[PDB]
Ligand SMILES: CC(C)CCC[C@@H](C)[C@H]1CC[C@H]2[C@H]3CC=C4C[C@@H](O)CC[C@]4(C)[C@H]3CC[C@]12C
Ligand SMILES: CC(C)CCC[C@@H](C)[C@H]1CC[C@H]2[C@H]3CC=C4C[C@@H](O)CC[C@]4(C)[C@H]3CC[C@]12C
Ligand SMILES: CCCCCCCC/C=C/CCCCCCCC(=O)OC[C@@H](O)CO
């Protein structure tokens with residue numbers, strides 16, 4: 436039996452040390468990844484590497500030998516490192532949560548206000564103040580119980596069980612774990628409530644149309660560029676480049692920069708907007724509508740044009756009478772729905788509900804924020820049960836088996852391995868692991 440547990444614990448160390456050295460490396464080697472956010476991810480990663488190299492392995496021998504075969508000085512140091520890694524890991528997570536907040540309520544949506552050099556200072560501090568609070572109590576012995584079982588364990592060098600007093604237990608938990616946890620969950624629930632709130636026409640058309648900086652063919656077969664900017668219906672590729680160079684104002688050779696796709700895009704959206712106000716059949720509907728349904732209208736006119744969207748004679752009349760569901764059935768009865776299936780579905784849903792729900796997590800910068808959520812969410816699942824139990828042991832010390840304590844603690848330990856897997860959501864990371872691994 437015990438041989439079976441050794442493999443598990445051995446396998447587990449390897450994954451933490453493989454997985455995280457890989458994350459640290461990626462970020463260290465590929466400029467594309469050197470960002471404020473991924474600098475904190477490095478801070479997390481290291482926490483886990485120290486967890487995997489210096490904590491988990493000795494925890495593992497502790498169990499199987501049923502004793503502490505490593506001496507007093509280490510035991511003390513081993514426990515202070517253990518605390519350090521969890522303390523630093525929640526505070527980093529919390530600090531990411533606050534960074535993404537200030538980033539998303541700025542007009543530089545999605546970018547950190549922090550510069551790189553400031554990113555490093557925060558991290559140093561988070562580690563120093565984590566370090567002092569994690570090492571001092573343990574070394575200065577402020578953590579020590581005064582009952583017979585505990586004073587006996589402190590003397591025995593083969594004994595290294597985590598006996599502490601309750602003023603240490605409750606204080607440290609709160610300042611080290613509950614405080615930053617509660618702020619993380621609270622602040623980062625607001626980051627989602629903002630991603631959704633600040634969805635607008637531009638991001639919606641960005642999700643629906645995508646982005647291509649070369650010349651390509653839409654489903655009709657016509658020549659398009661940018662965020663769905665149409666150039667010419669004629670099947671002549673030079674006619675495409677003819678209109679492009681015209682539309683930009685330079686020699687282009689069938690290729691354009693992002694600071695030109697965006698300024699074409701903003702003329703196409705203004706074009707669509709002026710079309711709705713110019714056209715008699717559309718204008719009166721558009722004024723009845725709220726901001727979110729108005730976006731759904733502009734989307735349509737982007738795709739078909741004023742003429743075409745005016746043709747939906749029934750659907751428009753209903754929309755104006757706020758009869759959302761009926762009119763959503765008409766728009767399903769359309770050449771439009773048939774040709775482009777998904778785009779239609781998402782647009783109609785917006786008319787239907789008056790909410791951005793169909794574009795939940797569709798934008799790339801929002802998928803980036805979901806991934807960040809999971810890293811947080813998973814910490815909370817993996818460590819919280821243990822930290823509640825550590826606190827329900829202080830109110831009635833006769834209530835939870837040491838076998839339960841060790842299990843729940845090791846769920847903590849096993850959380851260090853999950854962050855790297857979760858990063859294989861990001862393409863930026865998925866490619867970085869690949870070059871590194873030599874796949
Ligand atoms: C294992 C125990 C005893 C000691 C480990 C703590 C120290 C040495 C480690 C853990 C995390 C580390 C790093 C985390 C990320 C940044 C990013 C980089 O661009 C500057 C270095 C910097 C700021 C590091 C500073 C040193 C650091 C704080
Ligand atoms: C007691 C045991 C577990 C020791 C563990 C120490 C390891 C994990 C620490 C000590 C110093 C650390 C860091 C030193 C400088 C930074 C610069 C940064 O931009 C990339 C990561 C990098 C290079 C870190 C990698 C992890 C690191 C090497
Ligand atoms: C449990 C199953 C999961 C897998 C466990 C496998 C075994 C453990 C590996 C040891 C850690 C160190 C290995 C990580 C080093 C990778 C990076 C490096 O080799 O990349 C070089 C680069 O400069 C080129 O582009």
Ligand SMILES: CCCCCCCC/C=C\CCCCCCCC(=O)OC[C@@H](O)CO
Pocket residue numbers: 445446448449499500501
């Ligand atoms: C990859 C992460 C780290 C891996 C590192 C693994 C090192 C150990 C090697 C195998 C067993 C050694 C041989 C066993 C020799 C004596 C066994 C003894 O009888 O064990 C008593 C005890 O376990 C009763 O409770």
Ligand SMILES: Cc1ccc(OC[C@@H](O)[C@H](C)NC(C)C)c2c1CCC2
Pocket residue numbers: 514517518519521522596597604607608611612825844847
């Ligand atoms: C601030 C803090 C940080 C981490 C904590 O537990 C980590 C857990 O691996 C413990 C150390 N392992 C024992 C079995 C030794 C705890 C605190 C407060 C007390 C419990």
